[PDB]
Amino acid sequence: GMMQKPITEIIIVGGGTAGWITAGLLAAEHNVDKGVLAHSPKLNITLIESPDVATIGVGEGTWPSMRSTLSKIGIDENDFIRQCDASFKQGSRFINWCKDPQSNVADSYLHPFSLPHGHQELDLCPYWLPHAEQVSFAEAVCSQQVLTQLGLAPKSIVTAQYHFQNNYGYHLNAAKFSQLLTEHCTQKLGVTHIRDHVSQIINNQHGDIEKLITKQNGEISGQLFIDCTGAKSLLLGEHLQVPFLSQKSVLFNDRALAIQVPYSDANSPIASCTHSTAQPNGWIWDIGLPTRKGVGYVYSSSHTNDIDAQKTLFNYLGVDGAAADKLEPRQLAINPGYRAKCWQNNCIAIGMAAGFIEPLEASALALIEWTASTLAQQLPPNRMVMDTISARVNERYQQHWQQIIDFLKLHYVISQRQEDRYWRDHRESNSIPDSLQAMLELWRYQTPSQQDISYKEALFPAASFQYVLYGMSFNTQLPTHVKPSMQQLAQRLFNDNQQRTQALSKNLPTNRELLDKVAQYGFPKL
Ligand SMILES: [Cl-]
Known part of the structure; x- marks a missing residue:
């Protein structure tokens, strides 16, 4: 029937x-x-x-x-x-999220799309941890930190469609x-x-x-x-x-003020990553396309009015006076x-x-x-069996949304920003999901790992949590009784990452130089 x-x-x-x-x-x-x-x-x-x-x-x-x-x-x-x-995106770079900004203190870290080097052999994160004061997690385990800092692409013009170097x-x-x-x-x-x-x-x-x-x-x-x-x-x-x-009781933000921004020059460099620069009451995104940038301030209306938020956006853009008056940013409100x-x-x-x-x-x-x-x-x-499938799809959907909320909230909770109520409020327990509170406690004592995820095909792997947690200088107790064989494997993998980074840094094009050739010739099919 x-x-x-x-x-x-x-x-x-x-x-x-x-x-x-x-x-x-x-x-x-x-x-x-x-x-x-x-x-x-x-x-x-x-x-x-x-x-x-x-x-x-x-x-x-x-x-x-x-x-x-x-x-x-x-x-x-x-x-x-x-x-x-389109342009190539190799991750998100987070600027000024960790500390109240000081003119002589750099505050930036990368959440790259590349997984940590040698991930199929050994999770390098706990092996990196003792060295946190000497080298960043991202520099230690991937090449993209260095390469994206240099404005380089993830592939060469000779690389096949959809294939990559990073x-x-x-x-x-x-x-x-x-x-x-x-x-x-x-x-x-x-x-x-x-x-x-x-x-x-x-x-x-x-x-x-x-x-x-x-x-x-x-x-x-x-x-x-x-x-x-x-x-x-x-x-x-x-x-x-x-x-x-x-x-909203977790993330607070319920506004965005968005605008397109031309480059100063027709061949201005294109950034390799999305930039996210923290502000007093939210953060500003900056997405580089070949023709222009898209910029927006995500913020909480219970922390700032729209007049002041606009001023913050315009400050980031470096515009004031009559120049600012001609700009037409667009405001969106959400739950x-x-x-x-x-x-x-x-x-x-x-x-x-x-x-x-x-x-x-x-x-x-x-x-x-x-x-x-x-x-x-x-x-x-058929319809008779559909509910068995919808039930399991809904369960996975619910897992994904819990992970998204917790992962996003992590970015705020481990800041050390103190000057603004917004940032202080983000560390208060009533705004932190219980699932994330449990992780924050566990991660004081051990690194994030695949063991933290129970289900198949997570949207974010453990590495994403490592990149954010340690990008933001979170302290984890050092492992004890480390196995020499694994220390030796780790050291080999760290060396190999360093060598690969160096090789790629010398061979990859900038984004604009690559996109110019993609326009004119294209990547090969094979
Ligand atoms: Cl768009």
Whole structure:
């Protein structure tokens, strides 16, 4: 019967990166073999996009997962870079997060995308710990600290598409990316595109969504509905009443003031990483695209008004007077948090419809990729068994969100900043999740490790926690009774990292010099 009917009719409500990444990943996984669309494909995928003009952004970052997403969808890296105003991102550099700023005291550390050297052989972190006053964790275990300081790229012009010398994601223009995906998905992957409004959402007798009545395209029936409607969460949050779990009592930030910033020169250097520079009441992001930068101040309205926040943004930009008066930064207000589940009945939320917080550590596109790829890998056979799959997807989703909140909060909690109430408040226990409190206590006595994560395929590996914890000079009790053989392995791996760093520092291009050649010639396919 109906409950045994294969799930083939898939309706995505909303476009943007959330909707089109979903469409592409689903079509590529089920409907394409060796780049060829099946004559009679498994899935019939329709995307209904509002004809209303979308909110504009000023640049967004990704994780290295995006290389895989693009490749799976079937996008050529040169085409992507050229069409989406993209540059290479090798991690996040955190400036002035640790201490109240002093003019003669450098305060910066890197959270690189590269894993610690020799990670398959030995976790170097506890072997580095005794040497913390002599060398940074990131310098000791990876090459990206040194290479990104030098403004160098993660690969050479001779390196194959999506391959690397050091792991990388991207900085990109999201609207241009959505446009590229619309073209690819509709013209090459067989996705049906409808530009219209949804006037009614109709349920069947069991409370599943059965069909949508559009304003001018009639009734669109389906079996699985993807909510990509953004923060309004029209299907999952509103129609299905899935509760929202506010995380503002942890992160505080509920504002962003954003602006695009031209480079001073047509060939100004492009930064290798996202920059995050701490301020009295939040932090400022700085994302370098080839054509310009995107800058924004994330802040807490319960700590500062908007007038003062704007002044802080303008100070960071180095503008005042008449120059500042011509600037038009854009203000957004949110309740940071996530829906209790991403999948209810036959509806799964992807993107902001599921949750959203400040872009610290760039979780937004990573969650889109995770949710879409997971659905594509776990397409339910039918409605009868769907709840077994949605339950386990929801459990993993809940694990991810707990990890995101805790990981982001970690960045604040271990600061030594004292001058501002905002920073002092971030260290108070009522703002620290119990799960993170437990870790902070444990990590006084041992390094973060894979043992701290119970489940498969975490969004952030233990290394990310190490990079932040020790980037910010957190003290961990030294291991005792260290095994000489392992000390010797560690020393070999430290040496090897040093040698690799030196070799790469002499051979890799700057970002702009590389992007110039990508524009003109491109990376090879193989
Ligand atoms: Cl953007």
